[PDB]
Amino acid sequence: TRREAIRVLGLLGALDPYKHKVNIEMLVNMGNLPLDEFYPAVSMVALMRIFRDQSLSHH
Amino acid sequence: VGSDPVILATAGYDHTVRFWQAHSGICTRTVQHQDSQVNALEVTPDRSMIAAAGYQHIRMYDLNSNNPNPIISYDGVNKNIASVGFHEDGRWMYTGGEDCTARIWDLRSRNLQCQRIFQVNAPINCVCLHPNQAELIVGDQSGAIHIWDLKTDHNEQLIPEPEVSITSAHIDPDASYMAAVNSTGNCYVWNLTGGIGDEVTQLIPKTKIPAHTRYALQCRFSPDSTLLATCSADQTCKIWRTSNFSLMTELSIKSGNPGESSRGWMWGCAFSGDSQYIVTASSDNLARLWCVETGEIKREYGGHQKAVVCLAFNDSV
Amino acid sequence: STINLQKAWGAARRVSKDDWLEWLRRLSLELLKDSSSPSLRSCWALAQAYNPMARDLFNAAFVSCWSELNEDQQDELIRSIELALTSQDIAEVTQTLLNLAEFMEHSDKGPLPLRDDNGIVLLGERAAKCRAYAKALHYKELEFQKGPTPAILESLISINNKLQQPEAAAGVLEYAMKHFGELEIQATWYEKLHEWEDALVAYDKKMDTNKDDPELMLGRMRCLEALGEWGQLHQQCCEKWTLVNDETQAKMARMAAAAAWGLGQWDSMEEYTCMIPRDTHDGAFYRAVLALHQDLFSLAQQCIDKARDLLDAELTAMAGESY
Amino acid sequence: LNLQGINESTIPKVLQYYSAATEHDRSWYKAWHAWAVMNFEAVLHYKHQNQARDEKKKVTEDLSKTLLMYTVPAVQGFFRSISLSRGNNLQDTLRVLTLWFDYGHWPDVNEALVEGVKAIQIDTWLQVIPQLIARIDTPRPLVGRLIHQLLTDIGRYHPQALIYPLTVASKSTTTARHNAANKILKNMCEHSNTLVQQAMMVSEELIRVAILWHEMWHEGLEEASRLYFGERNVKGMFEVLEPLHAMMERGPQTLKETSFNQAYGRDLMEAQEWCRKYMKSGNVKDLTQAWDLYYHVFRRISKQLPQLTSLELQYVSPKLLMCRDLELAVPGTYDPNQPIIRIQSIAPSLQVITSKQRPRKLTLMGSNGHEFVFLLKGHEDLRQDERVMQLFGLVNTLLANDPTSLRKNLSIQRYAVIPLSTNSGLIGWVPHCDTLHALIRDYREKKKILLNIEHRIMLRMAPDYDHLTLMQKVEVFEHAVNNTAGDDLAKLLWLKSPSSEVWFDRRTNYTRSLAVMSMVGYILGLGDRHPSNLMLDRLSGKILHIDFGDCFEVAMTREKFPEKIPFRLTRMLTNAMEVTGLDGNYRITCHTVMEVLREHKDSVMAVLEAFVYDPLLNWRLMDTNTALNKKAIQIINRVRDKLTGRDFSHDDTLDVPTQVELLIKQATSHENLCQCYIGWCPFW
Known part of the structure; x- marks a missing residue:
């Protein structure tokens, strides 16, 4: 299947990368806020990241 | 100052003109010059009064009396005055500025307005008086040299190199060779045809000397005409023998260490009475008296708060 | 509160990726426990259960x-x-440490002083190995700002080419030209920059001055192939065969076969292709081309299959980082 | 054409070649476009030749016959070329407008024009709406009636593309322009009348917001004081003051106007009374009393001005607060293809920016739910910016067409500009951007670095810098640059960037956009690029230019503090690019852009010529001077020399790489840089 994938890729032609292109914050937090305010900010961002989705059902 | 046979006036951005003594090197007196700096100092051939060129005004201070006010302040000009000439008779004063109009002034006449005007295209950067007292050399930012005849007003425009600013130009007293210098650092030399009445004054290019790599500020022939000093922004005042155009002596004020940036430009050259010594100004606020043959600082002048941009020297008896 | 910290620091007894990953997890958890900020210290219990929490914090x-x-x-x-x-560098741990270093550079505290010069060189090597070419370019540019060297220029050109910035790499070459003249510029720089004509001139003058060497011969031949002057390439190949060692012979065979194929000399093409190693994609490709010329279609199909099998690794490695 | 050139002999042979080419291929766009361009060029050449010979009876009639014979083929070819192109017809449409406005008074040319107008689709004319409206009051009735009919059709189909400039025209001081605008508007009203009424009320209220009565008094009194105490022009004094009193005579209309009349209205009426007493008597004691009252109210409004930080619609204009779900389209947003984004509501609060002009910050809400922020500019003409933006649109189209430019992702950042009057107008507010001056100031304040460190150093070395000569200036500038680390922009860019990958992408975009705008600006003759006049995008990193007030070498022509720098290329930007310098992305992008623009010199020339020959924009040239036609021809020739490459030396043609190198040397030259005004920040 690796061979067939490579073969079909060659058959379809080596697409120009530009043609492929046309076919297709925490650091900022530190840069803006001082450390004392930054610590709760990053903490809350990560906690919300866990808070959404089904990982919350575990944590 | 005036009584002393040797006059050495030095000034810069500090609004003062200081007359040093060659034998000692002590500031004899200072003259206030407000409202601007001075762009060029020159002593009249008669030695009666010095002249200071600044911005929009041409001041002339007395040389014999001490602590005088400006006797004459020729106003009515704009856009600075780069340099000033002086007729050997002492009647006509030649000046040039950035307004592209060289002006002729009559010291004896009261009239504030100038006498003759030569307008050019680019701002005038230097003016030099031919020893024959019949032609005026005028440079410009465009690099076109102009030879203004004082009798026929027939100006011959010559441009050694297109689109380079010419900064200074001088002719030896014997009218043998003329040197001109531009911001590229080249030193153009022209042979002078032996013509006075015919006014042909044909310039024959002799040699193009790569004098400097950076901006070259001023040049001047020695009285004996065998020597030609050349200053530049490289902080090296190079000296060339007229016969061969070779660097016999290189007067440098470099720190001798890579860890030093923009020590100070050097734009001053004045040969001694017999060309033994040479007075050189610098942006280090320190003028220096060098020995031509050896190349050593015999004496050093200090006391200026700001950069030194002008000089004066005269050994006339 | 620095005993377990010191134990984690001076352990240096990991011989596996999972061991170093466990060290990273222990370091993160200990940092959370020892953190002065109570907001950070409160997330240690959660980070114990969830690894992304530790990684983000x-x-x-x-x-x-x-x-x-x-x-x-x-x-x-x-x-x-x-x-x-x-020592024992690993992609994930290296990327995490590089992100840490970048964050410190951004912070007002300043970069972490690593083996002097804030570890500009070591971080550059690590970023290049982990394929963080943006970080590699940044660190190499800082090294350039501290001091420009031909090695720094070469590494900068390589990084820029790997970053798809031929214009920037050409600017680097222009800077090298203006500052170092011509001697310091190796023809390999033009070769990387695809300035094949300039590379050819450089190789010609180097061959004229310095005695003929296998490396210069190979470089000029590569430029010849890139230009397409099969006549000159084949002339050089025929002129220098018995003067060539076996390793340089193996490197020769590929370019020689390309030239022979371009000129249509099939006998020479077979001679060179037999010399091309079989374990190369080019070797398999040229063997298949000869099979097609001789109408050995079954062997051609088998050889093409082998060529794809070999191309597996190169295609996977290159497709790992962008298209 | 390349070999022989242009002269009497060449034209018939070239015309035969192009006519035969068109006959051999009717549907080919290139053949028809070339034939039309050749005929138009021949018309211009014959006109210039007759101007040079005859001016410097029968000959005039012969020229009329020859030009008429050359014109109709040009018109027909241009119309067919537009029809064939269908999308890239900006140059051909502008050429059609030039021929129409020049020789449309002739019956034969008018017949060709009307036939071509009937054949051509109406959508094309949307591109040149400002050009059409620039000549609404053309003296020639034959051309005027056809223009009016065309605009009537434009009103019938896509009315939203005409309502704004029609509204601007309706309120013009000159009688003919407003007469023609109202004549078109009455015909349009029979179609809708609702877009009409909404546009009128919107424009009036927006102008009222843009300039407030107290602000009008402040500026008028400033000019008045300059006239009297400076120039002693009492008659001009009364001429300047009287329109404000005439605007008082309307009476208050909003809460702000009522409050102003209560506070200052009595004093102003008293001052007018004393002025009238002076008029009938001529007494210094009579005039000085009005002067005392004027200065009193001037001081009061001067004190009040800083406090006007924000404006609420309920005071300034309750009508805009009333506006809800307007069919009137958002300015600068209508597109014939995309759905109309009509205004839903206007925000109640406008945040006035504390600047010299005090521009408002208007923000509309569209029917799609996306906010559209704009800046309300007062007492500044925006027609020049509109023409510049049209040129930028053409250049963007050319760059998109070019494969190399499209590959490199080269483009010009542009914002919607909508003139509202000769004084005020609307400017599209670009988000996520900040002036370079603001970035530098913020970084230096963060790093505890003195904001004017370079100026302080140069002043300390030489207090008389402004009066120093050239060599003293350059020495002072070099000392300041050497003794200062010019890496503020690069350092702040790196710090602002979140990660190194985004940092590199941002830097690449910054360098490419800077090169593109530098080359386009040089061709356009754009100067006065001080750090506040160009903005850096904090997300994409692309460079944006604003305030195209001076163009076509105005800064070079003006005697006071002349600028010798074709485009801003300061050392801080140079450091902000790659460590190598200009030799990489900047130079290569400049090569590509200059090559593309030199390729499409005909299109660039057509766009430039249209709004250079536009009468409404000749006041700039007249102000620069110290007649009109010679100045326009001279500037067009200068830009033509720029595009051809003969600008540096008339005799010698220059290739793209050599010209780019010379431009870079001129921009980076210390001698050329130290002439720039200190506020332009050459050291930065």
């Missing part, structure tokens, strides 16, 4: 700890980081 916890340390635990931690980066 890694930078902030490190900043808090590093600010707390009185320059001596700082020295010890810096030395431990140097040991981790230099």
Whole structure:
């Protein structure tokens, strides 16, 4: 299947990368806020990241 | 100052003109010059009064009396005055500025307005008086040299190199060779045809000397005409023998260490009475008296708060 | 509160990726526990269960700890980081440490002093190995700003080419030209920059001055192939065969076969292709081409299959980072 | 054409070649476009030749016959070329407008024009709406009636593309322009009348917001004081003051106007009374009393001005607060293809920016739910910016067409500009951007670095810098640059960037956009690029230019503090690019852009010529001077020399790489840089 994938890729032609292109914050937090305010900010961002989705059902 | 046979006036951005003594090197007196700096100092051939060129005004201070006010302040000009000439008779004063109009002034006449005007295209950067007292050399930012005849007003425009600013130009007293210098650092030399009445004054290019790599500020022939000093922004005042155009002596004020940036430009050259010594100004606020043959600082002048941009020297008896 | 920290620092007994990953997890959890900020210290229990929580809070916890340390635990931690980066380097741990270093550079504290010069060289090597070419270019540019060297220029050109910036690499070459003249510029720079004509001139003059060498011969031949002057390439190949050792012969065979194919000399083409190693994609491709010329279609199909099998690795490695 | 050139002999042979080419291929766009361009060029050449010979009876009639014979083929070819192109017809449409406005008074040319107008689709004319409206009051009735009919059709189909400039025209001081605008508007009203009424009320209220009565008094009194105490022009004094009193005579209309009349209205009426007493008597004691009252109210409004930080619609204009779900389209947003984004509501609060002009910050809400922020500019003409933006649109189209430019992702950042009057107008507010001056100031304040460190250093070395000569200036500038680390922009860019990958992408975009705008600006003759006049995008990193007030070498022509720098290329930007310098992305992008623009010199020339020959924009040239036609021809020739490459030396043609190198040397030259005004920040 690796061979067939490579073969079909060659058959379809080596697409120009530009043609492929046309076919297709925490650091900022530190840069803006001082450390004392930054610590709760990053903490809350990560906690919300866990808070959404089904990982919350575990944590 | 005036009584002393040797006059050495030095000034810069500090609004003062200081007359040093060659034998000692002590500031004899200072003259206030407000409202601007001075762009060029020159002593009249008669030695009666010095002249200071600044911005929009041409001041002339007395040389014999001490602590005088400006006797004459020729106003009515704009856009600075780069340099000033002086007729050997002492009647006509030649000046040039950035307004592209060289002006002729009559010291004896009261009239504030100038006498003759030569307008050019680019701002005038230097003016030099031919020893024959019949032609005026005028440079410009465009690099076109102009030879203004004082009798026929027939100006011959010559441009050694297109689109380079010419900064200074001088002719030896014997009218043998003329040197001109531009911001590229080249030193153009022209042979002078032996013509006075015919006014042909044909310039024959002799040699193009790569004098400097950076901006070259001023040049001047020695009285004996065998020597030609050349200053530049490289902080090296190079000296060339007229016969061969070779660097016999290189007067440098470099720190001798890579860890030093923009020590100070050097734009001053004045040969001694017999060309033994040479007075050189610098942006280090320190003028220096060098020995031509050896190349050593015999004496050093200090006391200026700001950069030194002008000089004066005269050994006339 | 620095005993387990020191144990984690000076352990240096990991011989596997999972071992170093466990070290990273222990370091992150200990940093959270020792963090002065109670907001950070409160997430230690959650981070124990969930690894992304520790990873996200890694930078902030490190900043808090590093600010707390009185320059001596700082020295010890810096030395431990140097040991981790230099020895037993691993992609994930290296990327995490590089992100830490970038975060510190961004912060007002300043970059972490690593083996002097803030570890500009070591971080550059690590970023290049982990294929963080943006970080590699940044660190190499800082090294250039500290001082320009031909090696720095060469590395800059390589990084820019790997970053798809031929214009920037050409600017680098222009800077090299203006500052170092011509001698310091190796023809390999033109070869990387695809300035094949200039490379050809450089190789010609180097061959004229310095005695003929296998490396210069191979470089000029590569430029010849890139231009397409099959006549000159084949002339050089025929002229220099018995004068060539076996390793340089193996490197020769590929370009010689390309020239022979371009000119239509099939006998020479077979001679060179037999010399091309079989374990090369080019070798398999040229063997298949000869099979097609001789109408050996079954062997051609088998050889093409082998060529694809070999191309597996190269295609996977290159497709791993962008298209 | 390349070999022989242009002269009497060449034209018939070239015309035969192009006519035969068109006959051999009717549907080919290139053949028809070339034939039309050749005929138009021949018309211009014959006109210039007759101007040079005859001016410097029968000959005039012969020229009329020859030009008429050359014109109709040009018109027909241009119309067919537009129809064939269908999308890239900006140059051909502008050429059609030039021929129409020049020789449309002739019956034969008018017949060709009307036939071509009937054949051509109406959508094309949307591109040149400002050009059409620039000549609404053309003296020639034959051309005027056809223009009016065309605009009537434009009103019938896509009315939203005409309502704004029609509204601007309706309120013009000159009688003919407003007469023609109202004549078109009455015909349009029979179609809708609702877009009409909404546009009128919107424009009036927006102008009222843009300039407030107290602000009008402040500026008028400033000019009045300059006239009297400076120039002693009492008659001009009364001429300047009287329109404000005439605007008082309307009476208050909003809460702000009522409050102003209560506070200052009595004093102003008293001052007018004393002025009238002076008029009938001529007494210094009579005039000085009005002067005392004027200065009193001037001081009061001067004190009040800083406090006007924000404006609420309920005071300034309750009508805009009333506006809800307007069919009137958002300015600068209508597109014939995309759905109309009509205004839903206007925000109640406008945040006035504390600047010299005090521009408002208007923000509309569209029917799609996306906010559209704009800046309300007062007492500044925006027609020039509109023409510049049209040129930028053409250049963007050319760059998109070019494969190399499209590959490199080269483009010009542009914002919607909508003139509202000769004084005020609307400017599209670009988000996520900040002036370079603001970035530098913020970084230096963060790093505890003195904001004017370079100026302080140069002043300390030489207090008389402004009066120093050239060599003293350059020495002072070099000392300041050497003794200062010019890496503020690069350092702040690196710090602002979140990660190194985004940092590199941002830097690449910054360098490419800077090169593109530098080359386009040089061709356009754009100067006065001080750091506040160009903005850096904090997300994409692309460079944006604003305030195209001076163009076509105005800064070079003006005697006071002349600018010798074709485009801003300061050392801080140079450091902000790659460590190598200009030799990489900047130079290569400049090569590509200059090559593309030199390729499409005909299109660039057509766009430039249209709004250079536009009468409404000749006041700039007249102000620069110290007649009109010679100045326009001279500037067009200068830009033509720029595009051809003969600008540096008339005799010698220059290739793209050599010209780019010379431009870079001129921009980076210390001698050329130290002439720039200190506020332009050459040291930065």
